[PDB]
Paper text:
The Eph extracellular region or ectodomain (ECD) is a multidomain assembly, consisting of a ligand-binding domain (LBD), a cysteine-rich domain (CRD), and two fibronectin (FN) III domains (FN1 and FN2).
As in previously published Eph–ECD structures, the region containing the LBD, the CRD, and FN1 is rigid, but the connection between FN1 and FN2 is flexible. The EphB2 protein is glycosylated at four sites: N265, N336, N428, and N482, as illustrated. As in some of the previously reported unliganded Eph ectodomain structures, the EphB2–ECD forms homotypic head-to-tail dimers via interactions between the LBD and the FNIII domains of two neighboring molecules. The size of the LBD–FN interface is 1103 Å2 and the specific interacting residues are listed in Figure 2B. For example, the FN C-terminal ‘tail’ (FN1-FN2) of one EphB2 molecule wraps around the LBD ‘head’ of the other molecule, covering several residues beyond the LBD and the FN2 domains. In EphB2, in addition to the 13 LBD and 10 FN2 residues, there are 12 residues within the CRD (including Ile-291, Asn-292, Arg-294, and Thr-295) and three residues within the FN1 (Arg-348, Arg-392, and Tyr-394) that participate in the head-to-tail interactions.
Numbering used by the authors: 19 to 543
Amino acid sequence: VEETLMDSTTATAELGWMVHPPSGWEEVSGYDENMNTIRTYQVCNVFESSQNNWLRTKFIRRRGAHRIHVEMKFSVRDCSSIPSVPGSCKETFNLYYYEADFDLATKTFPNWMENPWVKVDTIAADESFSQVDLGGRVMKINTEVRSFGPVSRNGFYLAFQDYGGCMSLIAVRVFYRKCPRIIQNGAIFQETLSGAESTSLVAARGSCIANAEEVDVPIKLYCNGDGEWLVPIGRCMCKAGFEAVENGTVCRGCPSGTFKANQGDEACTHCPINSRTTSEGATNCVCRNGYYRADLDPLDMPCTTIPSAPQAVISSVNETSLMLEWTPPRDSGGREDLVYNIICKSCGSGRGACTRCGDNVQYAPRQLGLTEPRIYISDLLAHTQYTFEIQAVNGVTDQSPFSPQFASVNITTNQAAPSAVSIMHQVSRTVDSITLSWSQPDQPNGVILDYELQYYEKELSEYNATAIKSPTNTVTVQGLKAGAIYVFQVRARTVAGYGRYSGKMYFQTMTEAEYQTSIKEKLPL
Ligand SMILES: *[C@@H]1O[C@H](CO)[C@@H](O[C@@H]2O[C@H](CO)[C@@H](O[C@@H]3O[C@H](CO)[C@@H](O)[C@H](O)[C@@H]3O)[C@H](O)[C@H]2NC(C)=O)[C@H](O)[C@H]1NC(C)=O
Ligand SMILES: *[C@@H]1O[C@H](CO)[C@@H](O[C@@H]2O[C@H](CO)[C@@H](O)[C@H](O)[C@H]2NC(C)=O)[C@H](O)[C@H]1NC(C)=O
Ligand SMILES: *[C@@H]1O[C@H](CO)[C@@H](O)[C@H](O)[C@H]1NC(C)=O
Ligand SMILES: *[C@@H]1O[C@H](CO)[C@@H](O)[C@H](O)[C@H]1NC(C)=O
């Protein structure tokens, strides 16, 4: 970024530059490269001998600059072109500067020689130029920049020296260079003026942007002479609850539905399932009411809840020993840390208040924290009634203000299994089904709850069998082959347990033709 301390082409009416001697430089109206009409200076005392012609600019405010740049546009007539020119002819001019705190210059001060002044360089027409048409004849306009520093006083003058040439100084622009305010690696680096030396790299310190915090230190950026910042050093990062936006220029609060817990430039991630943001810019998602997240739980994981009760409690009692199996709860709470607890309630044979179970009762594998849906129960009071409660508990249960969901079974020791079921008859049949029924076993020995039926193809074996559960003593079996003989065995279930499978009974589906006859009679639908 360049800041102009003086521009000769902004001259409204006339530049006030001092000419010494007046014999030399003269001010003349001219054109710029775009043919806009400006003020220029010229000197062509080529034949005259021993010429030292000086042109001094007005006072120029430094305005805090450190290295000053002077850009010069000009044209020179080549001494070859001038007929019968002496060897005094030159195609160069010299640039000088004088530093001062106040515009105290006269026609005699400072002295018009090299030393009160300071030489920048000898300027010549060298390969950097443009060509502009004027009225069919083209003019060559050279542009040359020079720089000088350090500069310390409030201002300075520039001086131009001719020593016997034909030249036209068209424009002079004086400027310094600054580096603009920038945001890099999360930091605001403020305006920095370029340094005095040509190769200067000036250092500036970064401060974190808005809702951001320093992460890697130190935070530094460097400004070069051409007005450009270099590669950054250090880093600021958007703090928790804030995400980097607008090519890293702002750190913005996390939008609703999103959270961020640790510092970073990354973007906020959505609240896990069954969680929500109380507000914007959230460091955490609050779990849904009745739902909790556990310690040691990944925070990407959804909020979870307690499991429901176990179901399908099936009990088989062998004398004082017992076996309880079941199937897992309908709702597992979203967790895989689900385990079962068994609580025992020894109770009177009648409606007397239940008592605590004995110390002697043995639980294999254990009373609590069961992994499989089954418990094998050892020594227990014989001919005694009891209630067993199997509760389901998962890894978030300890946060629940409610008691665990459980399943209950009332059962009595040394109770007899139902007798084997007598016989079964085929009620109806189709090509793919067999509907059949059987009699209640003659000696239930308790209340019967459900039945079990096992079927397999006669050509195949019990190895290939299937088993199903029947709430009543009649049921349909579907999916069978056409005209095939199937072997059926049935078993009853009381709280005490299962009976013995009945004798293998042999039924058969309709063949395809028999089913054709049946449906043909049934016509129409
Ligand atoms: C009904 O159940 C029986 C027994 O479970 C099944 O028979 C078994 O079928 C498998 C292939 O499905 C047989 O394994 C095969 O063994 C031969 C060598 O004999 C080998 O070349 C094959 O790559 C394959 O490993 C197995 O031997 C056989 N077992 C018996 C005792 O026969 C039968 O597939 C089941 N059918 C249905 C419809 O479910
Ligand atoms: C399992 O046994 C318990 C024994 O405590 C039974 O509990 C009683 O249930 C009746 C049901 O109306 C209540 O009126 C009683 O107050 C309960 N307490 C007692 C001490 O008897 C329970 O009903 C039995 N469950 C089944 C399905 O038989
Ligand atoms: C961010 O960078 C992309 C790069 O293609 C540019 O198109 C966009 O204008 C930049 N936005 C801002 C605010 O600088
Ligand atoms: C019950 O357990 C005994 C061992 O204590 C075992 O011999 C018997 O086969 C089991 N089953 C029945 C129905 O008794």
